[PDB]
């Protein structure tokens, strides 16, 4: 499915407990871990586009905020 790195399905379980929604089925946690990883790559990619559009080479929190808006 996904190339590169991705958040573990185990991390989804920890988050679920921290908010009190109970247990997650393994397929549900895997789907979410995959989905959030896809979202993370999109956010970083768009942020890097903003950074470059501004002729910078170091990603800033401002680039991430702009990306989260889009």
């Amino acid at each position: 499915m996904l190339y590169g790195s991705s958040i573990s399905a185990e991390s989804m379980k920890v988050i679920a407990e921290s908010i009190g929604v109970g247990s997650l089925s393994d397929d549900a946690a895997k789907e979410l871990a995959e989905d959030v990883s896809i979202k993370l790559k999109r956010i970083v990619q768009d942020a890097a586009k903003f950074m470059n559009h501004a002729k910078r080479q170091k990603l800033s929190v401002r680039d991430i905020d702009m990306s989260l808006k889009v």
């Binding site: 590169g4 790195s5 991705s6 958040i7 573990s8 991390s11 989804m12 988050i15 679920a16 908010i19 929604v21 109970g22 247990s23 997650l24 089925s25 397929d27 549900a28 789907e31 979410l32 989905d35 959030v36 990883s37 979202k39 993370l40 790559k41 956010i43 970083v44 990619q45 942020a47 890097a48 950074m51 080479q57 170091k58 990603l59 800033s60 929190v61 680039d63 991430i64 905020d65 989260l68």
Partner: protein, 68 residues
């Protein structure tokens, strides 16, 4: 720590060689926000189905209804 490493690896894989340290923090916060948002809705679906455990279908519907 485990998740911070994944985020650092994603940054490198997407060719972001340099970044402010707090970008990782921001991304971990996003991760939490996104997952909690989807799970919060998925829990309602699981409830209405009279289930104790959130399943794939619950996550899929939550994701679909909160855009895609």
């Amino acid at each position: 720590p485990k998740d911070a490493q994944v985020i650092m690896s994603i940054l490198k894989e997407l060719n972001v060689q340099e970044y402010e340290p707090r970008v990782v923090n921001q991304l971990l916060e996003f991760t939490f926000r996104y997952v909690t948002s989807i799970l919060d809705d998925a829990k309602v679906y699981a409830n209405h189905a009279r289930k104790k455990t959130i399943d794939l279908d619950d996550v899929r519907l939550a994701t679909e209804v909160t855009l895609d």
